[PDB]
Amino acid sequence: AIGPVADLTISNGAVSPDGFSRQAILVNDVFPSPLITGNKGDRFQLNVIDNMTNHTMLKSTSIHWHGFFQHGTNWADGPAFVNQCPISTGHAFLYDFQVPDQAGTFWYHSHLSTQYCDGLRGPIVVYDPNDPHASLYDVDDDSTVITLADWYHLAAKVGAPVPTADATLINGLGRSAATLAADLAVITVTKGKRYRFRLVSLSCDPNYTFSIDGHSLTVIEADSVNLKPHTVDSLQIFAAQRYSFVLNADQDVDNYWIRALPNSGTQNFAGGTNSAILRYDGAAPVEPTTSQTPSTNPLVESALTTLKGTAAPGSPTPGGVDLALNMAFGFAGGNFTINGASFTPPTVPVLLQILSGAQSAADLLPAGSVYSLPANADIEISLPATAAAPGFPHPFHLHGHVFAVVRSAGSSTYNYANPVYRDVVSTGAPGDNVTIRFRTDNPGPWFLHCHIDFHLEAGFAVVMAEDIPDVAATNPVPQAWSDLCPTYDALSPDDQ
């Protein structure tokens, strides 16, 4: 409902999405943050005007447009101290980029520290006027976007380092243990119509097992990649993932519970927690009293495939690529490690280090955390789960790319012929060996990290410095970008 050219003014104020009042982050004076839309191929010009005054939730900011490749615009990707210095308070900064060849469901969020958990995070839809699945539904609009989010009554830097959520929010509304009469979100449908619901996880931490009483869900898109339609009666969505599903509203006129069970915190639906309302036109304005039936056809990621049936890059055998890397997870001194290194943000953003003459992974900071990738090549990365990295299952995200999930969590098999492609994948439980492949078609430094935001904060990330020799020529930067670091570095600490 705004975009693709729009101002996004960021400020602080009180919100009460679960009927408990707390300070948080507002975007264009609202919470939850507003939906942005455009069409396939559009240029997006989003002018981020930072007016925040609260240092505990951070006065500075930086925005990632999650799922967008940013080819030629690596300076606009978002991550603080990888692709830019943060925008300073009392300043604005224009993200100006295009989205060739992409359409689906995305989202934006702060990518500075754990700031998005304090409320800067909203959905984005990029519509396809020739969507291959358009004929499966009648309604696809602002009222078919469903967000899931975790909410905490203490701020990200006020509560525990890995806190437990006080409420799940669905479209920005939900109940906690103490606010059992708080307003629930309502999603309205008309009997006889078919809906493209675009489900996006804005979570900082928990994954949700999502279902709607009485209704099956036909999944047709995962993380902005078109799928062959695949009907399920429930699905598990990890932080930062998206699915589109068609719901055919062909049940009796009634209210039905929409359920989103987290894997930690309150794990039941007593008093309508973890829930929202699917309301048919004509039904009474009351809560559902429908019953959950056991899921006997849950989404299984290894059973999903792309609409085109695209092979994984490379040849069908392990190590069948130009470069194979394994990421060994661990945890010590309160920090996560990958291959023995913990990510600390460097003071010079990784992109600026490359523009300033850094040539190799060994040159780039932080030391031990940066991997050089060859240009125009195929890559395979395995991310084996281990109890040495507490808080599994960890959902890893690769910026600047979609990847083929050749091996999924909970599966023993490898699929090179027709695997799902996506951009956030659960790395599963000890014994799994989640393995992805992608092509280096996009020069620039790109983050690869756990999307549980509290774990990224604790160092659980690396940077893929893809095609270093071509980064500068491929990504010419605007002078407003070049002015971010001197403005930020001049702040005193209390103004950060």
Ligand X SMILES: *[C@@H]1O[C@H](CO)[C@@H](O[C@@H]2O[C@H](CO)[C@@H](O)[C@H](O)[C@H]2NC(C)=O)[C@H](O)[C@H]1NC(C)=O
Residue 455 interacts with which of Cu ion, ligand X, none, CB < 5 to 8 Å by class: Cu ion
Per CB under 6 A, which of residues 50..69 are in contact with ligand X? 54, 56-57
Alpha carbons 244 and 227: distance in angstroms, whole number = 10
Active site residue 215: no
In this complex, which beta carbon is closest to ligand X, that of residue 229 or of residue 318?
A: 318
Residue 237 burial (CB < 10 Å; 0-12/13-18/19+)?
Answer: buried
Considering the candidates 71, 91, 394, 401, report the single residue annotated as catalytic. Answer: 394
The single residue listed with the structure tokens 């493209």 is 196
Q: Closest distance between ligand X and the C-beta of residue 488, in Å?
A: 20
Q: Is 230 annotated as a binding residue?
A: no
Active site residue 133: no
155 lies in the binding site for ligand X (CB under 6 A) = yes
> Among residues 28, 47, 433, 496, which is the contact residue for ligand X, using CB under 6 A?
433
* First-last CA distance in the chain: 31
Q: Is 449 annotated as a binding residue?
A: yes
Active site residue 109: yes
- Written as six digits, the tokens of 84 are 């830019």
> Which residue minimizes CB distance to ligand X?
155
Binding site for Cu ion (CB under 5 A): 66, 240, 394, 399, 447, 450, 452, 455
Q: Closest distance between Cu ion and the C-beta of residue 428, in Å?
A: 12
Considering the candidates 106, 197, 451, 468, report the single residue annotated as catalytic. Answer: 451
CA angle in degrees (0–180, nearest 5) for 172-49-442: 85
Active site residue 397: yes
* DSSP secondary structure string for all residues of 410-448: T------SS--EESEEE--STT-EEEEEEE--S-EEEEE
Q: Is 71 annotated as a binding residue?
A: no
Q: Closest distance between ligand X and the C-beta of residue 324, in Å?
A: 4
Residue 240 interacts with which of Cu ion, ligand X, none, CB < 5 to 8 Å by class: Cu ion
Residues 6+ apart with CB under 8 A from 105: 67, 123, 124, 125, 145, 198, 199, 200, 221, 224, 242, 243, 244
- Cβ 194 vs Cβ 139: under 8 Å: yes
Residue 326 interacts with which of Cu ion, ligand X, none, CB < 5 to 8 Å by class: ligand X
368 lies in the binding site for ligand X (CB under 6 A) = no
- Cβ 128 vs Cβ 196: under 8 Å: no
Nearest to residue 122, comparing CAs of 77, 73, 65? Answer: 65
Q: What are phi and psi of 241, to 5 degrees?
A: -70, 160
323 lies in the binding site for ligand X (CB under 6 A) = no
23 lies in the binding site for ligand X (CB under 6 A) = yes
Which H helix or E strand runs over 223? none
Alpha carbons 106 and 147: distance in angstroms, whole number = 11
Residue 16 interacts with which of Cu ion, ligand X, none, CB < 5 to 8 Å by class: none
Q: Is 66 annotated as a binding residue?
A: yes
188 lies in the binding site for ligand X (CB under 6 A) = no
Tally of CB atoms within 10 A around 132: 12
In this complex, which beta carbon is closest to Cu ion, that of residue 152 or of residue 256?
A: 152
Alpha carbons 380 and 382: distance in angstroms, whole number = 7
Active site residue 85: no
Active site residue 399: yes
Which H helix or E strand runs over 338? strand 335-338
Considering the candidates 71, 91, 109, 401, report the single residue annotated as catalytic. Answer: 109
Nearest to residue 470, comparing CAs of 401, 345, 377? Answer: 377
158 lies in the binding site for ligand X (CB under 6 A) = yes
Considering the candidates 133, 397, 401, 436, report the single residue annotated as catalytic. Answer: 397
**Candidate segments 272-280, 287-295, 299-307, 323-331, binder of ligand X by CB under 6 A:** 323-331
The single residue listed with the structure tokens 């990847």 is 403
**Candidate segments 275-283, 322-330, 349-357, 411-419, binder of ligand X by CB under 6 A:** 322-330
Active site residue 401: no
Binding residues for Cu(2+): 64, 66, 109, 111, 394, 397, 399, 449-451, 455
Catalytic residues: 64, 66, 109, 111, 394, 397, 399, 449-452, 455, 460
Q: Which residues contact ligand X by CB under 6 A?
A: 22-23, 54, 56-57, 154-155, 158, 318, 324-326, 382, 384, 433
Binding residues: 64, 66, 109, 111, 394, 397, 399, 449-451, 455
